[PDB]
Amino acid sequence: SMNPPPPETSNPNKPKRQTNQLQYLLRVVLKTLWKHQFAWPFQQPVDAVKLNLPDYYKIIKTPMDMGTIKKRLENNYYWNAQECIQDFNTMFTNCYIYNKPGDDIVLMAEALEKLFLQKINELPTEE
Ligand SMILES: COC(=O)C1(NCC(=O)Nc2nnc(C)s2)CC(C)(C)OC(C)(C)C1
């Protein structure tokens, strides 16, 4: 079975705004998670063809990854910070859904989620 197209990352017809929270999500949150030693499985869409995971997109119907999130932030695809936070949570929960408690990849995602939560804790007041 085939991979789906990646999630939409750019829509020129959407209204655009810069906020302190969106800037922080790109320059601090995404940046920190991206450079983490456990980031690599999450830096691009899961390639189920290359990885021989034929059931991945039978199970995961809302794919999300940090490559997509980076693109959405840098193309001003998000209007509300919560949209971006939701995408990070989708990425983590997808990993938990496809895999099982205690799997190495799950432990990796858990660590990244903990780091994410520490970084989101210091999200600036929308100002
Ligand atoms: C865990 O990830 C991986 O690196 C591996 N593939 C499965 C996979 O990618 N699962 C994902 N679940 N959520 C993601 C986001 S990635 C794991 C094993 C099976 C040990 O060996 C290969 C080489 C195929 C790489």
Swiss-Prot record:
JQ1, a thieno-triazolo-1,4-diazepine derivative, and I-BET, a benzodiazepine derivative, have been tested on tumors with success. Treatment with GSK1210151A (I-BET151, a I-BET derivative) has strong effets on mixed lineage leukemia and promotes myeloid differentiation and leukemia stem-cell depletion. This is Bromodomain-containing protein 4. Phosphorylation by CK2 disrupt the intramolecular binding between the bromo domain 2 and the NPS region and promotes binding between the NPS and the BID regions, leading to activate the protein and promote binding to acetylated histones. In absence of phosphorylation, BRD4 does not localize to p53/TP53 target gene promoters, phosphorylation promoting recruitment to p53/TP53 target promoters. Coiled coil: none annotated. Interacts with p53/TP53; the interaction is direct. Interacts (via CTD region) with CDK9 and CCNT1, acting as an associated component of P-TEFb complex. Interacts with RELA (when acetylated at 'Lys-310'). Interacts (via NET domain) with NSD3, CHD4, BICRA and ATAD5. The interaction with BICRA bridges BRD4 to the GBAF complex. Interacts (via NET domain) with JMJD6 (via JmjC and N-terminal domains); the interaction is stronger in presence of ssRNA and recruits JMJD6 on distal enhancers. Interacts with NSD3. Interacts with NIPBL. (Microbial infection) Interacts with bovine papillomavirus type 1 regulatory protein E2. This interactions may serve for the tethering of viral genomes to host mitotic chromosomes allowing successful partitioning of the viral genome during cell division. There is a cross-link at K58 (Glycyl lysine isopeptide (Lys-Gly) (interchain with G-Cter in SUMO2)). The record marks N99 as: Acetylated histone binding. Belongs to the BET family. The NET domain mediates interaction with a number of chromatin proteins involved in transcription regulation (NSD3, JMJD6, CHD4, GLTSCR1 and ATAD5). It comes from Homo sapiens (Human). Ubiquitously expressed. It comes from the Eukaryota. The chain holds residues 44 to 168 of 1362 of the full protein. It is linked to Cornelia de Lange syndrome 6: A form of Cornelia de Lange syndrome, a clinically heterogeneous developmental disorder associated with malformations affecting multiple systems. It is characterized by facial dysmorphisms, abnormal hands and feet, growth delay, cognitive retardation, hirsutism, gastroesophageal dysfunction and cardiac, ophthalmologic and genitourinary anomalies. CDLS6 inheritance is autosomal dominant. Chromatin reader protein that recognizes and binds acetylated histones and plays a key role in transmission of epigenetic memory across cell divisions and transcription regulation. Remains associated with acetylated chromatin throughout the entire cell cycle and provides epigenetic memory for postmitotic G1 gene transcription by preserving acetylated chromatin status and maintaining high-order chromatin structure. During interphase, plays a key role in regulating the transcription of signal-inducible genes by associating with the P-TEFb complex and recruiting it to promoters. Residues 17-123 form the Bromo domain. It is found in: Nucleus; Chromosome.
